[PDB]
Every structure is written in structure tokens, then in C-alpha cells.
């Protein structure tokens, strides 16, 4: 049927957009992959 | 041809894991018209409409995988207004035209430009003003800049209170 | 064979001006799962459908000049829950049968208590408890008494505040 | 496009269950119909 899915807390986009900053600068110095990732997606 | 007059674009550093959640904050943050989430595969675009539908939005979704009638009555459906998110893949040669849809989301960022500019891009020179959102993983941070660059624009970080003047 | 058995049924005396609005109060006031609106031709599903939309509310609807691969791709998108309310003619020979409906309006009444039966009736002795609403109209009145003898039930006026644990 | 329909107050349930009431006791002692019940529906 229809489950009720409701997250507790937000999303923090600024700790996101830190995350990819952090990312950049240290990078400075086929079923099987679908399934996986959409296991992590909607799992 | 299509450009990105009217369209702020922004992007959030996700996994993939936090895609629901994001999607789910930018639905409950942003103030929303209508919008269109584009996703990589028709069955990651019915899953995502099922989430969606779970999180209490009511949900529209096209896929290659469907016959053309289903597929065009449910866009005509969604431009009427029946219902405010459509998820959909890849298949739209022109440029959307739709003055409701202020916000579209990459949920799924493509590796090609054409793909990016065809889900984003305007007809003319008088498009209504519109948000791009693109969920960036890891796997999509050079793609992100080799898009951004062959295209001339700019794709700043999402802030955490968009003026509400641009969509 | 169909009954009624967990279905609690009500009238609201209504004029044409007022289905709108009476269908409105029954959307604000009603603790709605999903819901189910039944109208007499195609075009007033459209235009019903329309109506739902502007008032703030998600809309899928289907009726006979449809393609049937589109009708019942659709109808599968609704008991999945993408939207929560269905606008449909009399297409359905056997009763409804899902759990998340728990309201059904009869938008326009129907004349032949055979019809009232498919669009309200239930499969077995175990059906979930739902609501049965009909907006009753003057050229309705005769036919309201009628069907509710033939079926051996009764359609009671329709309450300010409903027993919540009937739906 | 879209437009946004409100209604002011509420239908008043109990005024239509009277006036059904009213009109029991009282009664006691193509294309052109439905293209103005429609008018009248939607317009």
C-alpha cells in the first residue's frame, strides 16, 4: 500500500557544499552498479 | 537553439543515500509551483515517483518505457496543472515551455551538456525566470565543471535562503 | 456478489453551483486517505478534474474515450498511491478493492441502483470501512429513495462532524 | 495556465439537510441541458 516517510531532521547544504570544497582541494594534491546504487537510493 | 537567460542554477554535494532527504528539503524549503526531476533510468524515475509519493507530494512520471499516448496525455495532464512534480527522463528535443515549472532538479546530473541544456535550457529570449537544481555525487564533480565550463555558465552552490525574486 | 457492509453512506442536498464547493468542504473538513469521485460523463471528469487542481488539490482521473493501456496505467499509479484522488465514470464490473480509499463520492448521483451498487459495493464479508457521500440534487430526490429501497440499506443526511472510526 | 480557487466560508450541511426536509414536505401536499449543467457546474 502507501507507507507515511517523513525525515527528522533537514538537509545542511552548507556542511554539503564544506564536504565538496574539502573534496576538491584533497583531490588537488553493469546490473550489478544500477542495482547497487539504487539500493542506496531508495533502499 | 536553447539558453539559460532566466535560469539561477545551483548545485548540493550529495551521496546517494541523501538524495531523498535532500529532494524532500528543497520540496519543504523552496516555494514550488510546479517542477521536473529528471533521473538517469525510468526505474529509478518510478521509485523516486513512489518516494515522492510517500513524503505526501503527489506525483506525475514519464519514461521511455511507455507507450506514446499514456506518455503525452500525462504531459498535457501535468501542464494543465493536475498535478505539481513530474519526474521524467531524457526525452524532450525542444525546451521545456512551461511558465508554472519554476524549479527543475537534476536529481540525476548527466555527463553530457546537450543532456544538461535540454532539461534546463529556454526557447528564446523571454523565458520565465526558473531554478536548476543538480544533485552532485562524487562520481559527478568533474562533469560538473566540464558542463559548467562548455556552456558559459555558472553553477554556484545552493544557498540556504534563495531570494525568492528568481523563481 | 457486492454489499455494503462497511460502507457508512450520506447525502448532501446540493445544487449545480454547489458541488464545488460542497466537494471542497468535504476535502477540508474529511479525514481523506484516498478518495474516489465518480461523475456521469467524461467531460465533467475533466472538468472536475480541473476544478480539484485549482483548489489546491492532486487529481488523477479516467473514463471510457481513453486508450485502455493509458486507463489502466493510470489506475495502477493511483492504487501505488502517487495521488489521492481518482475521477472516473462507471467502468469498474467488479468492486473496488483497495484499502487506502476509505471515501467515495458520488460526484452525480446515478439513477439505476446497479450502478450505486458497483461504484460503492464491496467483494466478501471483510471490506474496510469506508464513506459513501452523494451530492443529491432536486432531479436526485426520487432517485436517492428508489435505489436505497432496492438495495435495502439506508443513506442517512450527512452529519457536521463524522464518527472518525467509521473511515 | 494554473489558477488558484478559494472559497470563502463553508457549505452549510444542516441549512441543505433542512431544505431537503423542506422540499420532501413540500412535494408531499440533449446537448443544450447538458451544456448548462455544466455552465452552471463549472462555470
Known sequence: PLGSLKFESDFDFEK?????????????????????????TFG | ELTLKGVTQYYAY????????????????????????????????????????????????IHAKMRQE????????????????????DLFTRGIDIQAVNVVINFDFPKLAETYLHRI?????????????????????????????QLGTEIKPIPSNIDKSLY
Chains 1, 4 share one sequence.
Open chain 1, 16 to 40: 554539503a557544499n564544506e564536504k565538496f570544497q574539502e573534496v576538491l582541494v584533497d583531490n588537488l594534491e553493469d546490473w550489478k552498479k544500477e542495482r547497487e546504487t539504487n539500493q542506496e
Open chain 2, 121 to 149: 535550457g529556454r526557447s528564446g529570449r523571454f523565458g520565465h525566470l526558473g531554478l536548476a537544481i543538480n544533485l552532485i555525487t562524487y562520481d559527478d564533480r568533474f562533469n560538473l565543471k566540464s558542463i559548467e565550463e
Open chain 2, 14 to 61: 550529495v551521496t546517494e543515500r541523501q538524495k531523498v532527504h535532500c529532494l524532500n528539503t528543497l520540496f519543504s524549503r523552496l516555494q514550488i509551483n510546479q517542477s521536473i526531476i529528471f533521473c538517469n533510468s525510468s526505474q529509478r524515475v518510478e521509485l523516486l515517483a513512489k518516494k515522492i509519493s510517500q513524503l505526501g507530494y503527489s506525483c506525475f512520471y
Open chain 2, 70 to 89: 499514456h506518455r503525452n496525455r500525462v504531459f498535457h495532464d501535468f501542464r494543465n496543472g493536475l498535478c505539481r512534480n513530474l519526474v521524467c527522463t
